[PDB]
Write an enzyme that holds these catalytic residues in place. Structure first.
Site, mmCIF file in Angstrom:
data_model
loop_
_atom_site.group_PDB
_atom_site.id
_atom_site.type_symbol
_atom_site.label_atom_id
_atom_site.label_comp_id
_atom_site.label_asym_id
_atom_site.label_seq_id
_atom_site.Cartn_x
_atom_site.Cartn_y
_atom_site.Cartn_z
ATOM 1 N N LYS D 153 -4.365 -3.352 2.247
ATOM 2 C CA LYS D 153 -5.784 -3.182 2.535
ATOM 3 C C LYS D 153 -6.625 -4.094 1.659
ATOM 4 C CE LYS D 153 -5.563 1.148 1.456
ATOM 5 N NZ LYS D 153 -4.100 1.322 1.255
ATOM 6 N N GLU D 179 -6.373 2.516 -9.788
ATOM 7 C CA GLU D 179 -5.685 1.369 -9.223
ATOM 8 C C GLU D 179 -4.367 1.128 -9.939
ATOM 9 O OE1 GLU D 179 -5.351 -1.578 -11.117
ATOM 10 O OE2 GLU D 179 -6.407 -0.752 -12.858
ATOM 11 N N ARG D 180 -3.321 0.871 -9.166
ATOM 12 C CA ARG D 180 -2.097 0.357 -9.756
ATOM 13 C C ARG D 180 -2.314 -1.107 -10.120
ATOM 14 N NH1 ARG D 180 -1.368 0.699 -4.324
ATOM 15 N NH2 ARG D 180 -0.964 2.938 -4.593
#
Ligand code: ATP
Ligand code: ADP
Ligand code: MG
Ligand code: MG
Lengths: 514, 48, 463, 463
Positions: D153, D179-180
């Protein structure tokens, strides 16, 4: 109304009546108050840290995590059965440091790095604190360095590369450890480092695993920590962090490394039990909500980092290399209920996941990866050019197969292009099985799937296609050994490559007539 | 035509018996779930 | 030094102690009035700790005096305990006089070291088709009978004891855990009819007993076997140890019973949180080591017949040999009613079981898998509206199911038909012949409640 | 004056104070030993207060001096923020040296009044055919980006920010909300490649920072954008600023975790009982006014793929548009992978988008659902026995699905990575011509990987 405190012993009360000074000898040592189930409450030592190591009159060690108004709750590390009240304890001014260094390749020790092999004391010169923060995003690098698993679907449909985050989840006896150690097998020629964490299992399992490793000789570049089921939940709760510390040691030297887990779920249950004993609030499924934070903060340690961080760690001693380290957590399914809390949390973290199905393994598949759902959000960016190129055709073939499978119960009513798709897809479903302990080269599965795309399996009975493939392999082994040497050497793709492959494919048909 | 009617009647019967099965399943599963979250709530309230 | 009772709840007790004298966490505490005894569990502190009682909780008031032994529960041990019937305290119940030996051993002990496990690589033939086919055994392994309430957990064990006992020669031990007294007494008399009665020892901790007694009941027998394995034969080692567990679920249940009274919290269902660690502690002292071989059989009651319960789930992490029962199979009248699928064995190795064994088994499971899958549609649709090969496979699998149905040597009690013992070779040949379709012309009744394939031929030609 | 530590429990901090002066909620609390900082949660009387730490817990003993600030956290904002990545404390973490401006503002503020709200609704558009067709927006909107399992995405959000940057100085900033790291790292890299830093600043919640930090980065970015839009420039006019959230669900989960340790019972489902209040506070603080427009995009991942838990419902209580994707259509060689059947925009109305646009969308969706209802006969009978009726519909649906292809200006690189952003007028003209069947004589590949009708026709001439 307030209730009793673990500080209302009339001995202490009378002391207070006597005096209000000499505060716990300046809080240098406490006194045992409450003892139960590896959890001890102590009076004094208010100077100590949450996470500060503690010595004991029994010459033992423990970890308090609760600094109350006047009491402190602590957990044992080893056996607490030899303790009684009235004793004392002291803060060590330090947190757990475990020995670090490449002196354990082919060595297995305890959660506190203690020799369990019985092969003498482990040589060690360096130790690191078990708790460490993750590096800064400023220090990372995009992941494109490949990793191999030797599996048909996996090394094709689910790319794996250095530094990623991937879960394998399934039920009991599905090949959880089979795949992990298989990857460990896969590193025999990759020449990297890898470490395994035992998690609350029976020792016999560990022994058999070790014996298989030695059978492969894999326990020559390898280190494993043991956390048996009978072990105290403290060690069973801590050890994975120590393993990650082990790996980070080498990553900070800029080498390729892997760490592998065995159902962190057991670890989570143990931690829930512990934290419960802390009288801490139980949330959904009685877990305290922090469990997500606890896991995540452990898992983010894995990464591929910038060379800049590499030299700054080496003080510029080495710069040509970049640090990376990958991991595979393991979670069990409960009747495959993916909506289960813990694994759901896990998914929110990884770079992808791998699913197995029991109705596939009982069908003879091992491992019977559920390709319908398993994904690798990283993508083939860490897969070789040739395999990534070949991937798409197989991908769409399986897509079609699973898509039209709704009416597969009767192939008597459909049109004939549907029959063709059926046969091709079922043949691609074939060629997917794989024996354990068989390190399939990239050349192997590459030529197999190419011949698949070339109809060279679309002309042979699916019952025998496995033997077809094994022959193809051995045939090539005899003749085209330099060719596969080059193949497994490079990972790229060319047109003379394809011609010789195809020429080689023709030769097997011409040379042997499968 | 006759045999198609017979077969379709049998299909209707199979669907009905399964329908009874599904109402019972839904009822028990809903009861169990409800009791489960009740247990969670009563455990939680005991804390503070 | 002595202590005094200060509170009584259920079956858990608390006591006041002198500041000088606070007994260790595991000690025998004699009621100074009665024979009732106590074990410490929690150091409640400030001269007061918590304990449980063994035996009746009645006749007990507050302030009454109790001594300490300054010794944990250490029970008589040795071969002089064979052919005898003991309590949870290891004291005679058979009224055959006090035991002879004087050696005692504490019920508690740490697990053996990693450096001591053994490679149990010895198979076993039993005579039950489904077992010897699907679950090869390792002499020294852990054998659990996953099953619900009334699935045949006891029966499956009695018949194995018959077969196992007769096929074996050496040590053996039994420990009744929280079960019907009648069945236990009947087993005792049956053993008395045999003569390895001498070779074995009896101890019963039964459902009637108080939960405090119900808890530390296995410790006795498991320690017994651990000794006897470590009890080395002159110019040799320990012997082959026969161990038999009777619903460890009872022990789990007692742990549930006590946890709330222990000041403990309620697991996700209500169990003690410590259930996993205590189960592991229990299991780890059970192993065949470098010294001696210990063969263990486990009765595994399944609560509400559910697998997803935490306790069975933990249990699989403990059992190399897994055998599971079903209610629907018994609902079909098939005795025994073991499910082919879930019951598995890590001994199922082609390098171990022989190629043909492996592949035949795999094909069998495959056939059953398709049949179970198609069950849905065949319930919905007419059996006739299906592909011919599908229907063929259906009949194949049904005849397979029937060919599993076997009379057992003790099962003739509720039937009368004489039990069987089928050599594995007959099993393999018959199943292969079925999978070859050599019998597609044969009525399915010819396979029900039978033994070997020759019996099938006789039944069919008879029919 | 100053306070001292009295109890530490996980992330819960307790400090004593003089009753003469007690810090108020949300004000900054300076640890006198380290640079870790705290905020006020609950005034516990007698100088006692329950608090949470903004940074690591290590280094903290009871009775340790901590100073107050008597003021909430004011973090710096201004043009100097562009191309700067800083902590939740507004302090550079990207090694970009110290910040430049001193314009810092307290994080917590009020909710916008009813009267001051923007009184209209202006169309928000992407230029991408599938989106604007199916999910057109309003300037100031909020759209959920669901799932994500077939492609990144992040590629799509980067496309959107390309649209915004190449479009206007209407600013935009994404905030790393759970967030990774690899996302943020690589993202940053292509950002500096595009050199869009002169239009963005950055903050990460890294799943590792204290839950309060990851909980308040939302307020951080909120306040920054709030000023920046409300910063009227040269015209008494504010920009149209868009914000991006890695996952609001991460914020929700963080708050859920923290709520309990405050001595607060969880929600009925177990979430934080205060989710709605804070959530709506955020939402109303996300609103276009007479001073510029406030809009945000929120990448949401539904837990367990169930929409019945409170969090997705609360989102819907604010979701201006819902955009779902499918891995299958992404695998169909389709760039957007947008769900054309289960992704909707509230602003989808024959007034807001005009009647023609509305009805064209109606017609397209009718063709698509007709195709899907056709798929059963298509598979069963084939393609022949069905008459030409609805076969033109099948062609139209397939050529529309292929027509959905917009070569992304950043797309994994297959078509030179061009930005299509074809005007909605051309899009609707082409789509209505396709629905009419004007080019139903032209293969779907002509519509594949192409934008406008000029592109489709030129492609058809090529193929
Ligand atoms: N490719 C394979 N071919 C054949 N057998 C396999 C293959 N992979 C794994 N197995 C078998 O699966 C069996 C059970 O799985 P395994 O013990 O390796 O790990 P697991 O999935 O974690 O299960 P558990 O720990 O609960 O026993 C092993 O005995 C192994 O021989
Ligand atoms: N081998 C058998 N074959 C057929 N029927 C049996 C067999 N064994 C037991 N049954 C019947 O099933 C009943 C349950 O057996 P049992 O092993 O005692 O169950 P449980 O698991 O409750 O201990 C027995 O009482 C007997 O009537
Ligand atoms: Mg395993
Ligand atoms: Mg029973």
């Amino acid at each position: 109304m307030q209730q009793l405190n673990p500080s209302e012993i009339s001995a202490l009360i009378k002391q207070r009546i006597g005096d209000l000074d000499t505060s716990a000898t300046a809080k240098n040592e406490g006194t045992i108050v409450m003892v139960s189930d590896g959890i001890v409450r102590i009076h004094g030592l208010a100077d100590a840290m949450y996470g500060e190591m503690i010595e004991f009159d029994g010459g033992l060690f423990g970890m308090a995590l609760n600094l109350e108004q006047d009491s402190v709750g602590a957990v044992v590390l080893g056996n607490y059965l030899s303790l009684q009240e009235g004793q004392k304890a002291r803060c060590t001014g330090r947190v757990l440091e475990v020995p670090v260094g490449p002196e354990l390749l082919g060595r297995v020790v305890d959660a506190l790095g203690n020799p369990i092999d019985g092969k003498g004391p482990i040589d060690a010169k360096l130790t690191d604190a078990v708790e460490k923060v993750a590096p800064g995003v400023i220090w990372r690098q995009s992941v494109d360095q490949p990793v191999q698993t030797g599996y048909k679907s996996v090394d094709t449909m689910i790319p794996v590369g250095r530094g990623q985050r991937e879960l394998i989840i399934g039920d009991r006896q599905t090949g959880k450890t089979a795949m992990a150690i298989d990857a460990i097998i896969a590193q025999k020629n990759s020449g990297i480092k890898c470490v395994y964490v035992a998690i609350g299992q029976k020792q016999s399992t560990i022994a058999n695993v070790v014996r298989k490793l030695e059978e492969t000789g894999a326990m020559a570049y390898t280190t494993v920590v043991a956390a048996a089921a009978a072990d105290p939940a403290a060690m069973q709760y801590l050890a994975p962090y120590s393993g990650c510390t082990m790996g980070e040691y080498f990553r900070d030297r800029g080498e390729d490394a892997l760490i592998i887990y065995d159902d962190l779920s057991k670890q989570a249950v143990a931690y829930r039990q512990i934290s419960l004993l802390l009288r801490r609030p139980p949330g959904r499924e009685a877990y305290p909500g922090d469990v997500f934070y606890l896991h995540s903060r452990l898992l983010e340690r894995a990464s591929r980092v910038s060379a800049e961080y590499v030299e700054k760690f080496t003080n510029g001693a080495v710069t040509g290399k970049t640090g990376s380290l990958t991991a595979l957590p393991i979670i069990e399914t409960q009747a495959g209920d993916v909506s289960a809390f813990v694994p759901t949390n896990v998914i929110s973290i990884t770079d992808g996941q791998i699913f197995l199905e029991t109705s596939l393994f009982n069908a003879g598949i091992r491992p019977a990866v559920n390709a319908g759902i398993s994904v690798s959000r990283v993508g083939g960016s860490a897969q070789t050019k040739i395999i990534k190129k070949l991937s798409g055709g197989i991908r769409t073939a399986l897509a079609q197969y699973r898509e039209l499978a709704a009416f597969a119960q009767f192939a008597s009513d459909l049109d004939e292009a549907t029959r063709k798709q059926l046969e091709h897809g079922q043949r691609v479903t074939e060629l997917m099985k794989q024996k354990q302990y068989a390190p399939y080269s990239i050349a192997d599965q590459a030529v197999s799937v190419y011949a698949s795309n070339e109809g060279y399996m679309a002309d042979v009975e699916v019952k025998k296609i496995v033997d077809f493939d094994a022959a193809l392999i051995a045939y090539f082994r005899s003749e085209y050994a330099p060719l596969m040497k080059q193949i497994d050497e490079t990972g790229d793709y060319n047109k003379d490559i394809e011609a010789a492959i195809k020429a080689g494919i023709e030769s097997f048909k011409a040379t042997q007539t499968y | 035509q006759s045999a198609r009617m017979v077969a379709m009647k049998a299909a209707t019967d199979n669907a009905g018996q399964l329908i009874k099965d599904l109402q019972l399943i839904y009822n028990k599963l809903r009861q169990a779930a409800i009791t489960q979250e009740i247990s969670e709530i009563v455990g939680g309230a005991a804390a503070v | 030094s002595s202590g005094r009772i200060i509170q009584i709840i259920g079956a858990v007790i608390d006591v006041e102690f002198e500041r000088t004298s606070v007994p260790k966490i595991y000690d025998a505490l004699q009621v100074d009035g009665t024979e009732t005894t106590l074990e410490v569990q929690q150091q409640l502190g400030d001269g007061v700790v918590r304990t449980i009682a063994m035996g009746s909780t009645e006749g007990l008031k507050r302030g009454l005096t109790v001594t300490s032994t300054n010794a944990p529960i250490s029970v008589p041990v040795g071969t002089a305990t064979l052919g005898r019937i003991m309590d949870v305290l290891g004291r005679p119940i058979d009224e055959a006089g006090p035991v002879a030996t004087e050696e005692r051993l504490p019920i508690h002990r740490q697990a053996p070291s990693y450096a001591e496990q053994a490679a149990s690589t010895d198979l076993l033939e039993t005579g039950i088709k489904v077992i010897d086919l699907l679950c090869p055994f390792a002499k020294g392994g852990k054998v659990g009978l996953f099953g619900g309430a009334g699935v045949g957990k006891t029966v499956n064990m009695m018949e194995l004891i018959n077969n196992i006992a007769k096929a074996h020669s050496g040590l053996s031990v039994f420990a009744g855990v929280g079960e019907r007294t009648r069945e236990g007494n009947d087993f005792y008399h049956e053993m008395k009819d045999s003569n390895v009665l001498d070779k074995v020892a009896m101890v019963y901790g039964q459902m009637n007993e108080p939960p405090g007694n119900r808890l530390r009941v296995a410790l006795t027998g498991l320690t017994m076997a651990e000794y006897f394995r470590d009890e080395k034969d002159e110019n040799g080692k320990g012997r082959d140890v026969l161990l038999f567990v009777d619903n460890i679920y009872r022990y789990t249940l007692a742990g549930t019973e006590v946890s709330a009274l222990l000041g403990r919290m309620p697991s996700a269902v209500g169990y003690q949180p410590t259930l996993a660690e205590e189960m592991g502690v229990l299991q780890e002292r059970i192993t065949s080591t470098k010294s001696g071989s210990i063969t263990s059989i486990q009765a595994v009651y399944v609560p509400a017949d559910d697998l997803t319960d935490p306790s069975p789930a933990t249990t699989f992490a403990h059992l190399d040999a897994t055998v599971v029962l079903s209610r629907d199979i018994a609902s079909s009248g098939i005795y025994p009613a073991i499910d082919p699928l879930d019951s598995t064995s890590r001994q199922l190795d082609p390098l171990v079981v022989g190629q043909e064994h492996y592949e035949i088994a795999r094909a069998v499971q495959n056939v059953l898998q398709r049949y179970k899958e198609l069950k849905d549609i065949i319930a919905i649709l007419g059996m006739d509206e299906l592909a011919e090969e599908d229907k063929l496979v259906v009949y194949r699998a049904r005849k397979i199911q029937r060919f599993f149905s076997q009379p057992f040597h003790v099962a003739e009690v509720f039937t009368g038909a004489p039990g069987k013992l089928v050599p594995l070779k007959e099993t393999i040949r018959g199943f292969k012949g079925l999978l070859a379709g050599e019998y597609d012309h044969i009525p399915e009744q010819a396979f029900y409640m039978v033994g070997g394939i020759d019996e099938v031929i006789a039944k069919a030609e008879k029919l």
